[PDB]
Amino acid sequence: PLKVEKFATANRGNGLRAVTPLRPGELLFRSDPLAYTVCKGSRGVVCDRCLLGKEKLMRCSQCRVAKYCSAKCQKKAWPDHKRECKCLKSCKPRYPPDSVRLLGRVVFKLMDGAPSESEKLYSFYDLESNINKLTEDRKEGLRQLVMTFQHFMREEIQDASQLPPAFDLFEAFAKVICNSFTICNAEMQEVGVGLYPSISLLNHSCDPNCSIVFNGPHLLLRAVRDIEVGEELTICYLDMLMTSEERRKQLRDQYCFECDCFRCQTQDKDADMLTGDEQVWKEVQESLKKIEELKAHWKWEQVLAMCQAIISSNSERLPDINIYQLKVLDCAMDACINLGLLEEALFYGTRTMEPYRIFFPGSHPVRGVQVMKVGKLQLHQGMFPQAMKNLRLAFDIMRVTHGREHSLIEDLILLLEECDANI
Ligand SMILES: C[S@@+](CC[C@H](N)C(=O)[O-])C[C@H]1O[C@@H](n2cnc3c(N)ncnc32)[C@H](O)[C@@H]1O
Ligand SMILES: [Zn+2]
Ligand SMILES: [Zn+2]
Ligand SMILES: [Zn+2]
Numbered sequence: 001p002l003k004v005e006k007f008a009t010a011n012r013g014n015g016l017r018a019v020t021p022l023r024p025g026e027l028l029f030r031s032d033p034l035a036y037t038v039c040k041g042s043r044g045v046v047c048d049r050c051l052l053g054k055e056k057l058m059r060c061s062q063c064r065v066a067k068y069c070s071a072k073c074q075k076k077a078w079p080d081h082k083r084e085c086k087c088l089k090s091c092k093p094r095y096p097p098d099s100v101r102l103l104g105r106v107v108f109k110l111m112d113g114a115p116s117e118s119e120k121l122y123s124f125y126d127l128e129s130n131i132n133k134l135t136e137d138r139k140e141g142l143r144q145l146v147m148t149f150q151h152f153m154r155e156e157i158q159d160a161s162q163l164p165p166a167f168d169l170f171e172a173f174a175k176v177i178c179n180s181f182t183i184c185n186a187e188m189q190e191v192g193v194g195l196y197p198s199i200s201l202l203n204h205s206c207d208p209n210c211s212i213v214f215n216g217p218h219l220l221l222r223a224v225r226d227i228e229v230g231e232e233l234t235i236c237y238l239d240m241l242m243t244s245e246e247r248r249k250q251l252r253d254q255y256c257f258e259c260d261c262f263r264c265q266t267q268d269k270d271a272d273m274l275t276g277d278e279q280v281w282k283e284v285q286e287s288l289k290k291i292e293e294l295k296a297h298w299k300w301e302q303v304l305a306m307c308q309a310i311i312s313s314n315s316e317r318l319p320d321i322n323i324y325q326l327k328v329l330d331c332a333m334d335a336c337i338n339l340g341l342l343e344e345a346l347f348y349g350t351r352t353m354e355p356y357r358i359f360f361p362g363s364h365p366v367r368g369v370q371v372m373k374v375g376k377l378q379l380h381q382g383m384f385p386q387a388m389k390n391l392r393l394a395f396d397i398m399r400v401t402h403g404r405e406h407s408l409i410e411d412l413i414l415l416l417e418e419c420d421a422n423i
Contacts, residue, residue, distance in 0.1 A: 016201040022227035025400040029221040034118040035105035036194030041296035049073040063088040121198035129174040133256035205234035241323040276318035284324040300335040307332035346377040368397035
């Protein structure tokens, strides 16, 4: 018996609403993707199938583009990779955009695969395209994606009889723009992109009552507030460390809507996240484009070098509640963890704790995972009372945001037991 149902909203299209009263942490829906792929920067770093990182991956012998963690993953992926393999081969070294690889997998799934459980509430055919709101600039970009797809797929798809019936590639890419999910690993690093059409019913709120988390490609949807019968379910489509102006731009450009929620009407938290000298944080915001590019390609030593130049700059510095400074601290912490600089990771991580408390209110998975990382660093440095406090706080958050069905909760229970045994 489902706890959620599709419905027609008054002014934001279709949505999901509660059928029964819901409590924080209640699992509402789980879904494998209709289709998904690894992202450009993680290609060859994480397994194409399970999206777990490894130091040595096995490559597909035919295309040598797909890479895997194990014979099992390579073999189990073969059906969903067989047709794209021919295309990826006849395209080296021109790798397609992620959206193109994703739509290719959509096409092969719809043509050759049984009806997907991911479409139980809403199908790819049903997805919102916002075509009558797209600017001419966006339509031109979509037309180039269509021709890129036609080029990439030419060996497996030659005509419309190889596409689903009444399948329009322009409309399909318009759907991908506003319904793609970025897949994050347990450490909240971006590793893939997928379509989850039933989950695509969720409309956006800058102060949402639900949250999603990923366990590999698997998606869990949970309540994070009390929800009444008939109340619409919402998730935040956006990173929380964004001003109302930045949210406005992305919600317009990618999702074609204007938000008039309370936070956007009052510029909630904007002033606090832009504290410090403007000339300084404009420069950090610029540097973060390069830092985040390097992080997306797992270039940890280069990330840390750039972050240290900011955090320990000889010139003027920013408060840790400035969102660009905060993102630099978080990148430096993650770089230090992956480089084994655990004392330095803890220094940066602990500085993010109070800003994360302010900017991730309630139960948010990103805060839960950050707190867990800090507790884990304190546990391995022997700071047991501090570690236990943070590990318990991470559990208080992640019991709501992640739940028993997420494997990270089992990892956290083991840390809590080890730290409790030390105490
Ligand atoms: C992932 S889909 C959500 C389901 C969609 N309403 C539908 O009918 O299929 C995202 C699209 O929903 C609409 N949308 C989502 N959240 C909204 C909101 N808070 N206000 C107005 N429109 C919203 C926009 O059209 C957006 O591009
Ligand atoms: Zn794998
Ligand atoms: Zn292959
Ligand atoms: Zn808003």
